[PDB]
Amino acid sequence: QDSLSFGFPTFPSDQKNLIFQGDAQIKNNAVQLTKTDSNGNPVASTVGRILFSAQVHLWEKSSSRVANFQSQFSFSLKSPLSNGADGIAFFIAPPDTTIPSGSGGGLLGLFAPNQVIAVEFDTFYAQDSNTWDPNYPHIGIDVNSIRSVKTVKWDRRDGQSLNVLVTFNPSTRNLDVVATYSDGTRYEVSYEVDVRSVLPEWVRVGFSAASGEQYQTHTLESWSFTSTLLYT
Amino acid sequence: QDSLSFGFPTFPSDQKNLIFQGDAQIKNNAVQLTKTDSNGNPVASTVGRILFSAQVHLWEKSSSRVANFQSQFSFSLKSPLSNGADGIAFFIAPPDTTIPSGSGGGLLGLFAPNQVIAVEFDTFYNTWDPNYPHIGIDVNSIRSVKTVKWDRRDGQSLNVLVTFNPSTRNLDVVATYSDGTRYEVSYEVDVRSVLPEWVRVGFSAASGEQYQTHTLESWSFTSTLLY
Ligand SMILES: CO[C@H]1O[C@H](CO)[C@@H](O)[C@H](O)[C@@H]1O
Known part of the structure; x- marks a missing residue:
């Protein structure tokens, strides 16, 4: 299809069009990307992702068309600890994408210790961090093997949903990329690509998240998406 | 998802979200539900269907909601015969639906010699x-719970x-040819x-001893659960 749209106001347990990878699963009408215990608390050493089942026709060489698309979503991060980690990301990758071996922790379940476009919301501390x-936590745009080609400072708020x-x-x-908390606090970052x-x-679109030694929940609460091929 | 929509202005050969069953395949940027030879001519004894890969949440008991949906499409039938058969149908069925054994010819690849709702365009020869050919609405195991006379026009697209x-x-159901000729039928269900x-949504078609192409040219669909 040249056009595809879908909307999940919430995520009831009876899902059909989501591809769950790693520890990702539905709990309390939301997608818990990273594992949580019997009490809803996050645990360490966990990675999980979801992809919408239908593939998206991003561009078509034969007609010199490229899709205009939008992805709206909200999530919340919660942790008993003072420094929850590591982060959640919206990404776009080849259809057969799977969790890279060893992509835990700061690699967010997206990168191995490739072909991808992602927007990550990180709360973990990085040694180098050249961007x-x-x-402080940051929002970063990823293009191929270049993580955080562009970033913007961001604030982590335990239990608060970020739109x-x-x-x-x-x-x-x-x-x-435009993100806002319920009080209107806004973060913006854009890049030409x-x-x-x-x-x-x-391609397929979805989300990824992980927690290494430090942890926090990565709760995807809602998600809508639309894509349409346009000449060009 | 509570809402889902997709559009196929045409059907290029590099499909990813279509579940092809039977002889259905892409040719000339259109879905040829039934088999055709090297010259593009329809052949006898063939059945074919397609289903969109993403499932549609038609209704939800927990929230007492039922979806409002729309399916627009265009197809054309062509045959060297003056009695091309058997027909094409848009249908809705359980996600794991497959061509029932022995469902060729007049059964259109939809019925065995059953959960489903379909709108069929039959050209072969009671309600x-x-x-003359007819458009019929099928509910569960009851074919043509209601119908309306229809005219087949070789090679002409029916929207x-x-x-x-x-x-x-x-x-x-509203169907029209490019000259404005219109056919309509509705039923409470x-x-x-x-x-x-x-459920999954798609099309099915078949030809027994009499044949014709069942060419799906385009298809758009939208569904949204409502209170
Ligand atoms: C101690 O290191 C581990 O935990 C931290 C914090 O979760 C991650 O950033 C890192 O990649 C490792 O998984």
């Missing part, structure tokens, strides 16, 4:  | 005048709109009484 202040809207306009090639140079014509 | 309103439970909460 953001390691002393995010990721939009891509093939005309300007701008990948725009020709999706044709990093991703195949057909 | 209808066998003297169709099938809609379902949960408030009235009316399943409406509580989807909860014949289909499970999650």
Whole structure:
């Protein structure tokens, strides 16, 4: 299909179109990307992801078309500890994408110790961190093997849902990210990217998250998406 | 998802979200539900269907909701015969649905010699005048619970709109040819009484000893659960 749209106001336990990978599963009408115990508390050493089942036709070389798409979602992170980790990310990858061996912790279940576009919301501390202040969490845009090609400082709020809207306009090639808490606190970051140079014509979209020695829940509460091929 | 929609203005050969069953395959940027030879001519004894891969949440008991959905599509039938058979149908069925054994010819690859709702366009020859083709609505194991006379036009595209309103439970069908000729039929149907909460949607077609192409040219669909 040239066009595809879907919306999950919530995530009841009877899901059919989600592909669960790792520890990802539905609990309390939400997708718990990372494992949680009997009490709803997060645990260490966990990675999980979900992908929508239908593949998205991102671009078509034969018609010189590229899709205009938008992904809106909300999540919340909760941790008994003072420094929850590691983060959650919205990503776009080849259809057969699977959790890379050894991609736990700060690798978010997305990178091995490739072809992908992702927007990560990190709360973990990084030694190097050449694109953001390691002393504070950040939102980062990932293009292929370049993580955080662009970032913006962000604040972690235990238990608070963050509303995010990721939009891509093939005309300007701008990948725009806007995130806000319920009080209106807003974070913005955008970067130019020709999706044709990093991703195949057909892809799958979803989310990934992980917790290494430090942990926190990565609760995806809602998600809507739309894509339409446009000439160009 | 509570809502799902997708659109196929055409059907290029590099499909990813279509479950092809039987002889159904892509040719000339269209779905050829029934088999055709090297010259594109229809052949006898063939059955084929397609289903969109993503399941549709038609209704939900927990929240007392039923979806409002619309399915628009266009198809054309062609045959060297003056009595091309047997027909094409848009249908809704359980996600794991497969072509029933011995469902060829007049059974359109939908019925065995059963949870489903379908709108069929029959050209072969009762709740209808066998003297001419007809559009029929099928509910569960009851074929043509209601029908309306229809005219087959070799090689001409028939645009169709099938809609379902949960408030009235009316399943409406409107079909037209490019000259404006219009055919319509509607029937009240509580989807909860014949289909499970999650279903797959698609098309089916078949030709027995009499044949014709069943070419699905385009298809758009949308569904949203409503209170
Ligand atoms: C101690 O290191 C581990 O835990 C931290 C915090 O969770 C991760 O960033 C890291 O990748 C390892 O998994």
